[PDB]
Amino acid sequence: KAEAMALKPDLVNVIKDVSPPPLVVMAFSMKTMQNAKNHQNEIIAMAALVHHSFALDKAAPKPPFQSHFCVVSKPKDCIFPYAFKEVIEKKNVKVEVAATERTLLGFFLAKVHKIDPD
Amino acid sequence: AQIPVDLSELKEYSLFPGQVVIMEGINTTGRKLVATKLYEGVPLPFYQPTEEDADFEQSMVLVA
Protein backbone atom coordinates (compact mmCIF):
# COMPACT_ATOMS: atom_id res chain seq x y z
CA LYS A 1 0.00 0.00 0.00
CA ALA A 2 2.85 2.46 0.70
CA GLU A 3 6.25 2.70 -0.99
CA ALA A 4 9.37 4.82 -0.52
CA MET A 5 13.01 4.82 -1.62
CA ALA A 6 16.26 5.80 0.10
CA LEU A 7 19.14 7.02 -2.07
CA LYS A 8 21.93 5.60 0.10
CA PRO A 9 22.09 2.97 2.88
CA ASP A 10 23.52 5.72 5.10
CA LEU A 11 20.04 7.31 5.34
CA VAL A 12 18.65 4.41 7.45
CA ASN A 13 18.85 4.25 11.26
CA VAL A 14 17.48 1.94 13.96
CA ILE A 15 15.48 2.12 17.19
CA LYS A 16 14.95 -1.17 19.02
CA ASP A 17 12.98 -0.26 22.18
CA VAL A 18 9.45 -0.09 20.75
CA SER A 19 6.82 -2.82 20.91
CA PRO A 20 6.09 -4.72 17.67
CA PRO A 21 2.78 -4.18 15.85
CA PRO A 22 0.14 -6.89 15.31
CA LEU A 23 0.29 -8.98 12.12
CA VAL A 24 -2.09 -10.68 9.69
CA VAL A 25 -1.95 -14.48 9.70
CA MET A 26 -3.47 -16.85 7.14
CA ALA A 27 -3.66 -20.63 7.51
CA PHE A 28 -4.78 -22.51 4.42
CA SER A 29 -5.31 -26.09 3.28
CA MET A 30 -5.86 -27.65 -0.14
CA LYS A 31 -6.98 -30.86 -1.84
CA THR A 32 -5.43 -32.56 -4.86
CA MET A 33 -6.53 -35.35 -7.18
CA GLN A 34 -4.19 -37.29 -9.46
CA ASN A 35 -4.71 -36.88 -13.18
CA ALA A 36 -5.63 -40.26 -14.64
CA LYS A 37 -4.13 -39.53 -18.06
CA ASN A 38 -0.53 -38.56 -17.26
CA HIS A 39 1.83 -36.74 -14.93
CA GLN A 40 -0.49 -34.24 -13.22
CA ASN A 41 -2.04 -33.68 -9.79
CA GLU A 42 -4.77 -31.05 -10.05
CA ILE A 43 -6.18 -28.79 -7.32
CA ILE A 44 -9.89 -29.25 -6.58
CA ALA A 45 -10.46 -27.48 -3.26
CA MET A 46 -9.04 -24.85 -0.89
CA ALA A 47 -9.92 -23.42 2.52
CA ALA A 48 -8.28 -20.54 4.38
CA LEU A 49 -8.61 -18.95 7.83
CA VAL A 50 -7.59 -15.35 8.50
CA HIS A 51 -6.75 -13.29 11.58
CA HIS A 52 -6.17 -9.57 11.05
CA SER A 53 -4.63 -8.78 14.47
CA PHE A 54 -2.11 -11.34 15.73
CA ALA A 55 -0.05 -10.20 18.72
CA LEU A 56 3.55 -11.39 18.41
CA ASP A 57 4.54 -10.53 22.00
CA LYS A 58 1.36 -11.64 23.80
CA ALA A 59 -0.73 -14.77 24.26
CA ALA A 60 -2.39 -16.44 21.27
CA PRO A 61 -5.82 -14.99 20.40
CA LYS A 62 -8.96 -16.98 21.17
CA PRO A 63 -10.49 -17.81 18.72
CA PRO A 64 -7.42 -17.92 16.44
CA PHE A 65 -9.43 -16.72 13.42
CA GLN A 66 -12.09 -14.17 12.50
CA SER A 67 -12.88 -14.69 8.80
CA HIS A 68 -12.61 -17.64 6.42
CA PHE A 69 -13.50 -18.71 2.89
CA CYS A 70 -13.68 -21.90 0.81
CA VAL A 71 -13.63 -22.83 -2.89
CA VAL A 72 -14.32 -25.97 -4.94
CA SER A 73 -14.14 -27.04 -8.59
CA LYS A 74 -14.38 -29.98 -11.02
CA PRO A 75 -11.20 -31.26 -12.68
CA LYS A 76 -11.99 -31.78 -16.38
CA ASP A 77 -14.59 -34.50 -16.79
CA CYS A 78 -16.82 -34.92 -13.71
CA ILE A 79 -19.84 -32.70 -13.11
CA PHE A 80 -21.21 -31.29 -9.87
CA PRO A 81 -24.18 -33.22 -8.44
CA TYR A 82 -27.64 -32.00 -9.40
CA ALA A 83 -28.87 -29.00 -7.37
CA PHE A 84 -25.43 -28.44 -5.77
CA LYS A 85 -26.05 -24.69 -5.48
CA GLU A 86 -29.51 -25.37 -4.05
CA VAL A 87 -27.94 -27.47 -1.27
CA ILE A 88 -25.26 -24.80 -0.77
CA GLU A 89 -27.78 -22.02 -0.17
CA LYS A 90 -30.00 -24.43 1.79
CA LYS A 91 -27.35 -25.08 4.47
CA ASN A 92 -26.10 -21.46 4.54
CA VAL A 93 -22.37 -22.06 3.98
CA LYS A 94 -19.87 -19.55 2.58
CA VAL A 95 -18.60 -21.78 -0.25
CA GLU A 96 -17.67 -20.21 -3.57
CA VAL A 97 -18.14 -22.66 -6.45
CA ALA A 98 -15.93 -22.41 -9.53
CA ALA A 99 -16.10 -24.01 -12.97
CA THR A 100 -12.48 -24.77 -13.92
CA GLU A 101 -9.11 -24.83 -12.18
CA ARG A 102 -8.10 -21.48 -13.69
CA THR A 103 -11.06 -19.67 -12.11
CA LEU A 104 -10.24 -21.26 -8.75
CA LEU A 105 -6.62 -20.09 -8.99
CA GLY A 106 -7.72 -16.59 -9.96
CA PHE A 107 -10.13 -16.39 -7.02
CA PHE A 108 -7.45 -17.63 -4.62
CA LEU A 109 -4.92 -15.10 -5.92
CA ALA A 110 -7.45 -12.26 -5.67
CA LYS A 111 -8.24 -13.18 -2.05
CA VAL A 112 -4.53 -13.43 -1.19
CA HIS A 113 -3.89 -10.01 -2.71
CA LYS A 114 -6.85 -8.34 -1.00
CA ILE A 115 -6.28 -9.81 2.47
CA ASP A 116 -2.51 -9.19 2.13
CA PRO A 117 -1.24 -11.60 4.81
CA ASP A 118 2.18 -11.32 6.42
CA ALA B 1 17.64 -44.61 -1.52
CA GLN B 2 15.44 -47.11 -3.37
CA ILE B 3 12.29 -46.42 -5.41
CA PRO B 4 10.03 -48.66 -7.53
CA VAL B 5 10.10 -48.11 -11.31
CA ASP B 6 7.03 -48.36 -13.54
CA LEU B 7 7.81 -49.44 -17.11
CA SER B 8 4.32 -49.29 -18.66
CA GLU B 9 5.06 -46.12 -20.65
CA LEU B 10 8.55 -47.19 -21.80
CA LYS B 11 8.71 -48.29 -25.43
CA GLU B 12 12.11 -49.98 -25.80
CA TYR B 13 14.38 -51.07 -22.95
CA SER B 14 16.80 -53.80 -21.86
CA LEU B 15 17.54 -54.19 -18.16
CA PHE B 16 19.48 -56.55 -15.90
CA PRO B 17 20.26 -56.32 -12.17
CA GLY B 18 23.34 -54.28 -11.31
CA GLN B 19 23.20 -52.09 -14.43
CA VAL B 20 24.27 -48.49 -13.84
CA VAL B 21 21.64 -46.50 -15.72
CA ILE B 22 20.32 -42.97 -16.24
CA MET B 23 16.53 -42.67 -16.47
CA GLU B 24 14.24 -39.78 -17.36
CA GLY B 25 10.71 -39.85 -16.04
CA ILE B 26 7.98 -38.40 -13.86
CA ASN B 27 7.98 -38.67 -10.07
CA THR B 28 5.18 -36.56 -8.58
CA THR B 29 4.67 -38.29 -5.22
CA GLY B 30 8.31 -39.20 -4.60
CA ARG B 31 7.59 -42.89 -3.95
CA LYS B 32 7.36 -44.22 -7.53
CA LEU B 33 8.99 -43.32 -10.86
CA VAL B 34 7.18 -43.67 -14.19
CA ALA B 35 10.09 -44.08 -16.60
CA THR B 36 9.73 -42.46 -20.02
CA LYS B 37 13.25 -42.41 -21.49
CA LEU B 38 16.24 -44.74 -21.07
CA TYR B 39 19.56 -43.24 -22.17
CA GLU B 40 21.75 -45.63 -24.16
CA GLY B 41 25.16 -46.65 -22.85
CA VAL B 42 28.45 -45.39 -24.31
CA PRO B 43 31.52 -47.64 -24.77
CA LEU B 44 35.25 -46.93 -24.16
CA PRO B 45 37.53 -45.73 -26.98
CA PHE B 46 39.44 -48.36 -28.92
CA TYR B 47 43.16 -49.00 -28.65
CA GLN B 48 45.29 -46.49 -30.56
CA PRO B 49 47.85 -48.33 -32.74
CA THR B 50 51.44 -47.16 -32.89
CA GLU B 51 53.74 -47.13 -35.91
CA GLU B 52 55.27 -50.47 -34.88
CA ASP B 53 51.90 -52.24 -34.70
CA ALA B 54 51.24 -51.64 -38.41
CA ASP B 55 54.48 -53.40 -39.42
CA PHE B 56 53.44 -56.82 -38.05
CA GLU B 57 52.68 -59.67 -40.43
CA GLN B 58 49.83 -62.15 -40.70
CA SER B 59 49.35 -64.50 -37.74
CA MET B 60 47.07 -67.42 -36.89
CA VAL B 61 45.59 -67.98 -33.42
CA LEU B 62 43.86 -71.08 -32.04
CA VAL B 63 41.39 -71.01 -29.15
CA ALA B 64 39.99 -73.90 -27.11
From Swiss-Prot, chain A:
Subcellular location(s) of the protein: Nucleus; Cytoplasm, Cytosol
Q: Write down the disease named in this UniProt entry.
A: Pigmentary disorder, reticulate, with systemic manifestations, X-linked: An X-linked recessive disorder characterized by recurrent infections and sterile inflammation in various organs. Diffuse skin hyperpigmentation with a distinctive reticulate pattern is universally evident by early childhood. This is later followed in many patients by hypohidrosis, corneal inflammation and scarring, enterocolitis that resembles inflammatory bowel disease, and recurrent urethral strictures. Melanin and amyloid deposition is present in the dermis.
What is this protein's function per UniProt? Catalytic subunit of the DNA polymerase alpha complex (also known as the alpha DNA polymerase-primase complex) which plays an essential role in the initiation of DNA synthesis. During the S phase of the cell cycle, the DNA polymerase alpha complex (composed of a catalytic subunit POLA1, a regulatory subunit POLA2 and two primase subunits PRIM1 and PRIM2) is recruited to DNA at the replicative forks via direct interactions with MCM10 and WDHD1. The primase subunit of the polymerase alpha complex initiates DNA synthesis by oligomerising short RNA primers on both leading and lagging strands.
Q: What is known of its domains?
A: The CysA-type zinc finger is required for PCNA-binding.
What quaternary structure, including any partners, is listed in this protein's UniProt entry?
Answer: Component of the alpha DNA polymerase complex (also known as the alpha DNA polymerase-primase complex) consisting of four subunits: the catalytic subunit POLA1, the regulatory subunit POLA2, and the primase complex subunits PRIM1 and PRIM2 respectively. Interacts with PARP1; this interaction functions as part of the control of replication fork progression. Interacts with MCM10 and WDHD1; these interactions recruit the polymerase alpha complex to the pre-replicative complex bound to DNA.
Q: What else is known?
A: In eukaryotes there are five DNA polymerases: alpha, beta, gamma, delta, and epsilon which are responsible for different reactions of DNA synthesis.
**Family per record:** Belongs to the DNA polymerase type-B family.
* Protein's name according to its UniProt entry: DNA polymerase alpha catalytic subunit
Q: Which gene encodes it?
A: POLA1
Please indicate which part of the intact protein appears here, giving the first and last residue numbers and the full length: 515 to 632 of 1462
From Swiss-Prot, chain B:
Tell me the subunit arrangement. Component of the alpha DNA polymerase complex (also known as the alpha DNA polymerase-primase complex) consisting of four subunits: the catalytic subunit POLA1, the regulatory subunit POLA2, and primase complex subunits PRIM1 and PRIM2 respectively. Within the complex, POLA1 directly interacts with PRIM2/p58.
Its annotated compartments are: Nucleus
According to its UniProt entry, this protein's organism is Homo sapiens (Human)
Modification note: Phosphorylated in a cell cycle-dependent manner, in G2/M phase.
The domain section of the record reads:
The N-terminal 240 amino acids are sufficient to mediate complex formation.
Gene name on record? Answer: POLA2
Domain of life per record: Eukaryota
Regions that span the bilayer:
none
| Assigned protein family | Belongs to the DNA polymerase alpha subunit B family.
Name of the molecule in the record: DNA polymerase alpha subunit B
Q: Any idea what job this protein has?
A: Accessory subunit of the DNA polymerase alpha complex (also known as the alpha DNA polymerase-primase complex) which plays an essential role in the initiation of DNA synthesis. During the S phase of the cell cycle, the DNA polymerase alpha complex (composed of a catalytic subunit POLA1, an accessory subunit POLA2 and two primase subunits, the catalytic subunit PRIM1 and the regulatory subunit PRIM2) is recruited to DNA at the replicative forks via direct interactions with MCM10 and WDHD1.
